């Protein structure tokens, strides 16, 4: 069973060819993988245990049925085909093998006891993790008489005491020395089945996974993964004293491989090292698309290809996905400087606000969606809970802190009593949060960016009143926003006709990976610095704003707006990869700031 399988696996690893494409025939597929493993670190080999289903079918029966008596063979049979690069580079740990599956195999509700201890794949949404837990591997005993130190191994899954000192023979003198033994790591994680793929009218389950030595911190709460690993069940004891174990076992999953393919979202900020992992064939594409005279309007108009025109709101929500530069003000003692853009959408009903939030929330990774009455003051920022076991008050994070890199869509912004609305004043302007409660005195921080939607008071935009009276928000809160979009839309007989003609079409029947990669690039390798010709159009653009907004009674302008222009101007330069702010990048993001309140 052991020798008969490495011989059959090496063949696979050597002679395999696929009708597929990788990294955008080079026959030695897994030998090329094994070469890459040698040119860099990271001694793991991600094998797809379906390729081994084409090449063979009598190991693919024994890999998903005796996985713990096979995967060691799959390590050994890779160490030897590493002969090509043995002398060249000599790493230390070992080479590894990690079967997986592109597509899931089961749910969390159809795990049956004919599947105990055999490879299994599920999918879910990690809820919470834990801190590391040691786990002994090699004991280390020592006698009190002979003071002789033997080192017994854990082979089957338990540690046996020798009870005879190889020198003095006192028949029990061998204590166990803890901190001289060898330990390994172990983490406990909880999945939660996705809303899709669950029965009619039911509540999500959870499943406990156990990570191990190297996978120990490779996932975060809030991630959607495709875990692959063995499925085990261990007994439990009714007393922690007697050996009377129960008869109903308890199951978990010894994870073996993760996979976070989130193509429905963009790129999270764990892949900044992975931006250097772009095909140079692609950087040409991006740099060339960034030269067309209107790449702004060509990318913007590709957001949410179901909303009708609304041309400006998509401009704003596109500049929000880039944000101003991240300058480093630690020297001037000023503190830090917000670089993300907060957008407010106000306008009479039916104008498709909540659809834009529902679209963004499903686009950006690390986001949240909240509402008006179903969210409290402390549930948005940070609460203090009586931890159940230890009976102690411990801190937790709300919604505005769980996002932290992304967008916190807050629908129904009007219908939040003024208490829970005055909480956003801190987290949305300084990017911080200062907590001082019973035993907890700390100061969090986050890099969120609100995107709120409200209705006018009376829910009807009556043009008799003044703009600062249909909104009915204070000034110490309207100034923390910098793009207040008034969707003033009546019954334009032409607009209604065009919209209906568009909506009906959805009943008969640019790319993403351009945008999904353009964004990662424009985040990784761009930092627009102002100029002197741009800086000289930014001063007057604020001295006129005052005289304008003073009289009309619409919305006054405080010096904070002069920073927003910066935030907007720079954010425009990033769209075209210009790496330097010039004049036009101020006129554009000034016309945008002016022609939104009209």
């Amino acid at each position: 069973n052991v020798a008969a399988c490495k011989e059959n696996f090496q063949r696979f690893l050597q002679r395999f060819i696929d009708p597929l494409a990788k990294e955008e025939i080079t026959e030695p597929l897994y030998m090329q993988r094994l070469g890459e493993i040698n040119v860099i670190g990271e001694p793991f080999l991600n094998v797809n245990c379906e390729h081994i289903k084409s090449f063979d079918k009598n190991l693919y029966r024994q890999l998903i049925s005796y996985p713990q008596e096979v995967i060691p063979t799959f390590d050994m049979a890779v160490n030897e085909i590493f002969f090509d690069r043995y002398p060249d580079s000599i790493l230390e740990h070992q080479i590894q093998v990690r079967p997986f599956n592109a597509l899931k195999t089961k749910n969390m509700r159809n795990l049956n006891p004919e599947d105990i201890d055999q490879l299994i794949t599920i999918s879910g949404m990690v809820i919470r993790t834990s801190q590391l837990i040691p786990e002994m591997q090699e004991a280390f005993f020592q006698c009190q008489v002979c003071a002789h130190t033997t080192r017994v191994e854990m082979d089957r899954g338990r540690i046996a005491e020798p009870s005879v000192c190889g020198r003095c023979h006192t028949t029990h003198s061998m204590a166990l020395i803890h901190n001289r033994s060898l330990f390994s790591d172990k983490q406990m994680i909880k999945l939660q089945e996705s809303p899709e793929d669950m029965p009619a009218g039911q509540t999500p389950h959870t499943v406990i996974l156990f990570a191990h030595n190297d996978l120990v911190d490779k996932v975060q709460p809030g991630d959607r993964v495709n875990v692959t690993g063995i499925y085990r069940a261990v007994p439990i004891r009714v007393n922690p004293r007697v050996s009377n174990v129960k008869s109903v076992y308890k199951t978990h999953i010894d994870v073996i491989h993760y996979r976070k393919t989130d193509a429905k979202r963009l790129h999270g900020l764990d892949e900044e090292a992975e931006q250097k992992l772009f095909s140079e064939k692609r950087v040409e594409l991006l740099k060339e698309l960034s030269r067309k005279p209107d790449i702004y309007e060509r990318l913007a108009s590709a957001l949410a290809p179901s909303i009708y025109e609304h041309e400006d709101i998509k401009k704003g929500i596109l500049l929000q996905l880039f944000g101003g530069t991240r300058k480093d003000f630690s020297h001037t003692g000023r503190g830090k400087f917000r670089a993300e853009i907060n957008i407010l959408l106000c306008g009479d009903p039916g104008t498709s606000k909540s659809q834009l939030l529902q679209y963004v929330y499903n686009l950006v990774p690390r986001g949240q969606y909240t509402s008006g009455k179903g969210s409290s003051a402390v549930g948005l920022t940070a609460y203090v809970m009586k931890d159940p076991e230890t009976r102690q008050l411990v801190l937790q994070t709300g919604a505005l802190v769980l996002s932290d890199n992304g967008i916190c869509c807050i629908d129904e912004f009007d219908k939040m009593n003024e208490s829970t609305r005055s909480v956003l004043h801190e987290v949305m302007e300084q990017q911080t949060l200062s907590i001082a409660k019973a035993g907890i005195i700390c100061q969090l921080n986050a890099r969120t960016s609100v995107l709120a939607a409200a209705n006018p008071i009376e829910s009807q935009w009556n043009p008799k009143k003044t703009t600062i009276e249909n909104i009915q928000l204070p000034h110490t809160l309207l100034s923390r926003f910098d793009l207040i979009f008034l969707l003033l839309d009546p019954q334009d007989e032409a607009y209604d006709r065009r919209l209906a003609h568009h909506l009906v079409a959805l009943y008969y029947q640019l790319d993403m990976a351009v945008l999904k990669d353009y964004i990662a690039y424009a985040h990784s390798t761009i930092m627009p610095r102002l100029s002197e010709e741009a800086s000289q159009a930014l001063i007057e653009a604020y001295v006129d704003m005052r005289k304008i907004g003073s009289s009309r009674g619409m919305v006054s302008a405080y010096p904070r707006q002069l920073e927003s222009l910066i935030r907007l101007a720079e954010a425009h330069a990033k769209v075209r990869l210009s790496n330097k702010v010039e004049a036009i990048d101020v006129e554009e993001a000034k016309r945008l700031h002016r022609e939104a309140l009209k």
């Binding site: 901190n179 996002s403 932290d404 110490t476």
Partner: protein, 358 residues
């Protein structure tokens, strides 16, 4: 039959005992023979050896400490009980402790894997709680019960451990010994909890925490709210209720603030005018003699605020403080002044406060 020479430990003990005497400072005058002087008056029992100097004097040693720091700690402390017998006034059963400092390389509370147990690391964090101080039994002296002898020098490991063998061929109770408690050896023991510092938090994460165990004359250095910088070894600890389950614990030996505002060592005009380095004191004098000082602290404290010249002055006079007096009856006059600002939107109110607090 006789015990085994733990050679890697005793050779290190010997070389450390040599280093303690040979190493000298810039002017001869062996330095660990004068810091070890105050080590005799009561309540002092920790010598603080810098680690960078142990790098100068030797390097085949530093790589033994920094890799076996738990094997060879019980010997680097005996090699301090012999080096200090040259004083003759120490109680003969007193015991001393070595406390390193100034390690080269730092770490983070999230880099404390399980591949680090038993080594010598260095950690920075905040401080959340501080439990009270206790005694802890390091080596009990079991007064035998039937023999009326004294079984002696028995080491405990996280439990009471009840050694059960007597050197008397007639010991009717290999399961009964009443230990004394007026000869045994105790050491202080405080257990505090530290929380990951702010500048290390990965974005979108709740800060972790671990237990550190101060175990010496170092027992109340860290208080709650401080940002100390601990340097000890990571150890594993069982669950003594069933003596398994293990949990990680930091076993600190030295603790010092993370960034000393005055790098000398850490309360009237003279005590402070002593620590003033030559340039420090020739600059403070220059300022105190400066004219128009009251206009170069405003212009130098709030450099990015045009105007409100009557607010910066008040803020300064708030920072300097008045004279706090205590009336003879028992009351007390308030010494420091309070200041409130009230104004239109966006007039640089929160900017004065952020300036002052940073």
């Amino acid at each position: 039959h006789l015990e085994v020479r733990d050679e890697v430990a005793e050779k290190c003990q010997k070389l450390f005992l040599d280093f303690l005497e040979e190493f000298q400072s810039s002017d001869g005058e062996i330095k660990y023979l004068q810091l070890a002087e105050e080590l005799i008056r009561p309540e002092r029992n920790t010598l603080v050896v810098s680690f960078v100097d142990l790098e100068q004097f030797n390097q085949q040693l530093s790589t033994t400490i920094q890799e076996e720091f738990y094997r060879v700690y019980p010997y680097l402390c005996r090699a301090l009980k012999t080096f200090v017998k040259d004083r003759k006034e120490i109680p003969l059963a007193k015991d001393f402790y070595v406390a390193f400092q100034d390690l080269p390389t730092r770490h983070k509370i999230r880099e404390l894997t399980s591949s680090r147990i038993g080594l010598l690391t260095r950690i920075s964090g905040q401080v959340v709680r501080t439990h009270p101080v206790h005694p802890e039994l390091v080596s009990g002296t079991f007064l035998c019960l039937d023999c009326q002898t004294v079984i002696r020098d028995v080491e405990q490991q996280f439990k009471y451990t009840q050694p059960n063998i007597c050197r008397n061929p007639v010991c009717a109770n290999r399961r009964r010994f009443l230990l004394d408690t007026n000869k045994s050896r105790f050491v202080d023991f405080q257990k505090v909890r530290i929380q990951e510092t702010q500048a290390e938090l990965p974005r979108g994460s709740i800060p972790r925490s671990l237990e550190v165990i101060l175990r010496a004359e170092a027992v109340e250095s860290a208080q709650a709210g401080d940002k100390c910088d601990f340097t000890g070894t990571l150890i594993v600890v069982p669950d003594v209720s069933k003596l398994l389950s293990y949990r990680l614990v930091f076993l600190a030996c030295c603790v010092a603030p993370t960034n000393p505002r005055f790098g000398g060592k850490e309360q009237t005009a003279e005590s402070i005018k002593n620590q003033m380095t030559v340039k420090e004191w020739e600059k403070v004098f220059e300022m105190s003699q400066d004219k128009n000082l009251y206009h170069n602290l405003c212009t130098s404290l709030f450099p990015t605020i045009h105007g409100n010249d009557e607010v910066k002055r008040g803020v300064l006079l708030m920072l300097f403080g008045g004279v706090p007096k205590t009336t003879g009856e028992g009351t007390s006059l308030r010494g420091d002044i309070n200041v409130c600002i009230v104004g239109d939107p966006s007039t640089a109110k929160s900017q004065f406060l952020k300036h002052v607090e940073e």
